[PDB]
Write a protein that binds this ligand. Structure first.
Ligand code: HEM
Length: 291
């Protein structure tokens, strides 16, 4: 399977910066969602789940085809709760009907990270919608009740190494787990709609307790009202993972730089860009534009 990026006809940077601005403006406007967390966290989880289906062995899945719009993928039990992110983006797709679905879902993740004052994420356009029969089957996304060996093996399918996995997991500082979506409940820290390295700091400094929640699943809970998934706590149980957790807890700029590289790679896996394709765009935030 080869997937060649094809720029939406006649579009350039200025067109995609208008779409970025439309998403950022609605993120600011619809601030009441999920007890005032806002839509930022569910939009970076949507960009990760539409990319996270990729398989390096046969180049199936991934963000290219925008197949989350089809019933099979939209209804995946692992995607429970992401309908809220799709509904947020639906008015913006009506306003810019020329953007492909893969490009809009991946750009929603980029916009959310940057507007929640995370690092700049370079982004490339050119994903092309593919037919319903190219939709990957359910079951390619990760379980939360496992250990470090499972996380390591799982991310080898997306060819992410240990460093890329630990950097990507720092996004779990954002938003919260919701009992009715996943069978887990609670936030991972106090700043859950501002992008920071707090996930690493909490993992190493909190006093965690293994408890059972109302859906009968075990999770790690702390005196401060925070929680961590079994796969999250994995990162301090493994010696290789633990030393990179300590590095990001002690250097927030290195965490931002490594996250940016791994998140762009996640969103681009499976796509072939021609050498006459445009360079990655770096979008300005609303704040840098005085908007
Ligand atoms: C082994 C890897 C991972 C597992 C098992 C996992 C699992 C989960 C689960 C169970 C939730 C809660 C869903 C809900 O109840 O609403 C969640 C939320 C979230 N995850 Fe992951 N995740 C993984 C990796 C990642 C990565 C790599 C990213 C992003 C780069 C990410 C971003 C998020 C975000 C932002 C949320 C919060 C969503 C919200 O507030 O609505 N996750 N994760």
């Amino acid at each position: 399977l080869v997937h060649v990026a094809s720029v939406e006809k006649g579009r350039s940077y200025e067109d995609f910066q208008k779409v970025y601005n439309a998403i950022a403006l609605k993120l600011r406007e619809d601030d009441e969602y999920d007890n005032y967390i806002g839509y930022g966290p569910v939009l970076v989880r949507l960009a990760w789940h539409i990319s996270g289906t990729w398989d390096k062995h046969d180049n199936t899945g991934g963000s290219y085809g925008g197949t989350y719009r089809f019933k099979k993928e939209f209804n995946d039990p692992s995607n429970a709760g992401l309908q809220n992110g799709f509904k947020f983006l639906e008015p913006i797709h009506k306003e810019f009907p020329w953007i492909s679905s893969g490009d809009l879902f991946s750009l929603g993740g980029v916009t959310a990270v940057q507007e929640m004052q995370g690092p700049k994420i370079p982004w490339r356009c050119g994903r092309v919608d593919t037919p319903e029969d190219t939709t990957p089957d359910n079951g390619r996304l990760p379980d939360a009740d496992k250990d470090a060996g499972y996380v390591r093996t799982f991310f080898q399918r997306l060819n992410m190494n240990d460093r890329e996995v630990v950097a990507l997991m720092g996004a779990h500082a954002l938003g919260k787990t919701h009992l009715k979506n996943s069978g887990y409940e609670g936030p991972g820290g106090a700043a859950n709609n501002v992008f920071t390295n707090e996930f690493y700091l909490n993992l190493l400094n909190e006093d965690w307790k293994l408890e059972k929640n109302d859906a009968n699943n075990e999770q790690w809970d702390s005196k401060s009202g925070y929680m961590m998934l079994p796969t999250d706590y994995s990162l301090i149980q493994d010696p290789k993972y633990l030393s990179i957790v300590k590095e990001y807890a002690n250097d927030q700029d290195k965490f931002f730089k490594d996250f940016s590289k791994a998140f762009e790679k996640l969103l681009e896996n499976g796509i072939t860009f021609p050498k006459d394709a445009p360079s990655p765009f770096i979008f300005k935030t609303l704040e840098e534009q005085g908007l």
